[PDB]
Structures are given as C-alpha cells and as structure tokens.
C-alpha cells in the first residue's frame, strides 16, 4: 500500500546556473515518486559510490525523506571528497554525513543539456578562521555535514583572484573579534562538470518517498485476512497475518 502523488521535480536543478561548492543548493523530497535513473540518464556519469546503502537500494527503496545537494565541481578534485580527505576543500566548503546512509555522484554535462548554464569559473574557499579579541590569536572554522561554510556570508559569489582576503568584525553575541576568509579559483573545462550529494533518512516519518510502481488487485489487505503474507506499507516491510 502506497499513496499516489507526483513525480519528483528536478527541473530547478536543470534550469539555471550551477551553485558553488561552499554555497550549494538543497532539494528536499517528501511524499514523492522518484526516479534516480531518469535523472542520471541526463548526465555522462563519471563515478557513483555509496556508503551504508547500496547503489541499488538508493534507487529502489522507500525513504522518510530524500535530500539532494547539488553544485558545480572540478572533476579533478575528487580526491578531497573522501570522508578521510586531506581537508583543502572538504573541511571548509562541503562535508557529508558519515552517520546517515549517503551517496556521491560525479558527472559531466553533455552538450545536449542546454537548459543548465555554464559558470565563469570554479571557486572554493581554502582558508576560513576566526580571530580573537586580541587580534593575534586565530582559530580555524570548519563546516559540518549539513551546514554551510561558517564564513559563507563573508565570501562573495565568486573568487575573483586567488588570495582575495575577506574580513568582518563580529558582534558581542559571538564573543567579538573578527571572522576572516580566503579562497582560490580553478579554470573551467570545455564542458560543465558537476557533483551531487544524496542523503537518505529513515524512520522519522512515513516512508512515502518511493519509486513509482503499478499494482494488481490481489495486493490489498482486504480478502487476505487470516493468511500469512509478506507486506510493504508506505516503506514499512515485513511478514505477518492481518
């Protein structure tokens, strides 16, 4: 038993300019029929990995919520998307959860996908730290799994030149002092390259985020009463007698 709804709309993703890594966009799907293949069909995928969930399950099971985080990303920097990364990008721009089931998709954009536009260049932040009230002591400021860079409000939509240094003072609420940052650029390739993070949440609500499936009239509770059956009710599976 599943409710009917609408198909998950990924048009937003495909209808504008790709976000920067440290300023990505988040699409959350709830009560929805998804099709991961349909989406990936539009991209010349380079890689696809998962953790604590199979590549199959991510495209076939039911979830309480499905989160898609998308942004522009140089293909060549994949080495720092590992959980156990060096840090230059991971610890400041974008991190993913290691406690929830997650996947990572790396793909390039074909010439035919003309609805998605091309950025001037790639940007990222390499440095981000806080200065204390003594204007001498500094402490690194890192980004968490579901957060945005701690100094995202300081850094502009693009890094014009490597070494561009940004600064603002802090109000007493945060303990005063200064918050500072510095980034760099990467030359844009002939074709747009893009990355997608996926987080899967289970058990917090009705698992109504499912694939789209048809059905027969012999899969109802009614008229099956008293018999041992297998079941799947809004993502909740098991075996028993109704």
């Amino acid at each position, epitope marked *: 038993e599943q409710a009917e709804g609408v198909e998950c709309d990924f048009s937003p993703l495909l209808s504008g300019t790709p976000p920067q890594v440290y300023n990505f966009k988040r699409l959350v799907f709830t009560n929805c029929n998804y099709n991961l293949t349909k989406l990936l069909s539009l991209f010349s995928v380079n890689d696809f990995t998962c953790s604590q969930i199979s590549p199959a399950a991510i495209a076939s099971n039911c979830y309480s919520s499905l989160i898609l985080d998308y942004f522009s990303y140089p293909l060549s920097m994949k080495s720092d998307l590992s959980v156990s990364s060096a840090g230059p990008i991971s610890q400041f721009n974008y991190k993913q959860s290691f406690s929830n089931p997650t996947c990572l998709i790396l793909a390039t954009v074909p010439h035919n996908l003309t609805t998605i536009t091309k950025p001037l260049k790639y940007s990222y932040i390499n440095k981000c730290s806080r200065l204390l009230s003594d204007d001498r002591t500094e402490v690194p400021q890192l980004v968490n799994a579901n957060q945005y860079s701690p100094c995202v409000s300081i850094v502009p939509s693009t890094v014009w030149e490597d070494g561009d240094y940004y600064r603002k003072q802090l109000s007493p609420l945060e303990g005063g002092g200064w918050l500072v940052a510095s980034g760099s650029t990467v*030359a844009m390739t002939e074709q747009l390259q893009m990355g997608f993070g996926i987080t899967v949440q289970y058990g917090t609500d009705t698992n109504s985020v499912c694939p789209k499936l048809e059905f027969a009239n012999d899969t109802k509770i009614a008229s099956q009463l008293g018999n041992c059956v297998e079941y799947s009710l809004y993502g909740v599976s098991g075996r028993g007698v109704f």
Partner: antibody
Amino acid sequence: VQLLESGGGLVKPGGSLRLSCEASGLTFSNVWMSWVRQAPGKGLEWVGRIKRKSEGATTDYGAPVKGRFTLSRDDSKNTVYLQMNSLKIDDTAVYYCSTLTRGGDVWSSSYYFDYWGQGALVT
Amino acid sequence: ALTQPASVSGSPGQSITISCTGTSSDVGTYDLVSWYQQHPGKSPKLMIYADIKRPSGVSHRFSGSKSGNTASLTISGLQSADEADYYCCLYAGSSTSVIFGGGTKV
C-alpha cells in the same frame, strides 16, 4: 604615465626574441603589467600578464603563446620583459607593453587595461 | 568569445552604436566588459570599463549600454574625428584569459 618599449626586429621562425619596456609616472611595484599583440589585418590579442612582487609576481598567458612565451619584471629598474623562447611565423605582430588594474572592490571586481605603450614590431 | 558588427557608420552629428554580444557568463551576470578605441598606427585607448563608466580623458559622446547578454558602445553626436577601430574586451579575474572581439570599423 609613459611605457617605453623596444627590442623588436626580424627573427626567422625557429629562433627567439625578447622584448622589454620601461614604466615611468607610476609606482612600478604597485601595478600589474602585461602584453598584447596585433598582427596586420587582425584585432587585439592577449599575450600574458604578470603580478606584483608582493604577490609572488606570478604569470598567466594567452593560449596562442602557451608554453612558448615567458613574462618577468624587475622593480629595481621599473622594467618588464617578454621572452619568446620559440618564434613562429604567425608571431609577426606589433607588441604592446601595457598595465592592468582593477576597479570596484574584493566583493565585486572589474578588470581593465588603462595604459598602453608605443609598441614594437616583431617579425 | 565576443561578437561584434563588421562596421558601424553614420554622418557627423548622428547617433550610432557598436554591439558586443556573448552569453550569461560574458555580459549577462557581471558588468565587466570594456571598450577600446584604436587609431591606425597607434596603440588602443580605454573608452569605457566595467560596462558603466569612462576615464576622464574620454568625451561624453561615449556611453555604455547593456541588455540581456548584449553589451554595446553608444556614440552620441559622432564626429568625423571618431573614425577608428573599436574593440570590445572581456576579462574577469584569475583562471581565465582576456577575450577580445574582432573589432569594429567605425
């Protein structure tokens, strides 16, 4: 501001040539320097640019001379150099010593070339 | 890449424009296109920068205009003394090259 440029001449393809120029009226150590070229019948084409000494004096080049031309500068003389390690016949052009600046701020920047020198002919 | 008209012309006193087209990354998103004027035998000079303003050495006849992904140079009350090769130039910051159009015969 005056940008005095010299060092042109005729060198057969396969050979090499170095251009140089001297800046006066500006603070050399506080400006970016660059080069462009223009062949007869063609429009303007970027050769490359060099940063300030305080910035490590790094360089960036146009694709047409990638891996062939090198830029350098020396603040003790207020001069800029462009060395053409390997010349091609297509390099026949007038070269121009120039400067590069930015407007706006760090949040939103805008780049442009303000000053240009007399130029020199490479053929 | 920047695309310009082969040539633009008119009589002294008339208003003419020189177009310079590109895409969202060239003109649309940022006000970073400049215009140059070159007389035969001479170096180019800067007429307008950042799609907005001119150097104090440039007359009021020359003004910028932008619409969508099209940039242009407007010459209001053109003079015979304005005859020159005009160039549209695009340049951002790091990790990118300087882009020039083919030039316009004005």
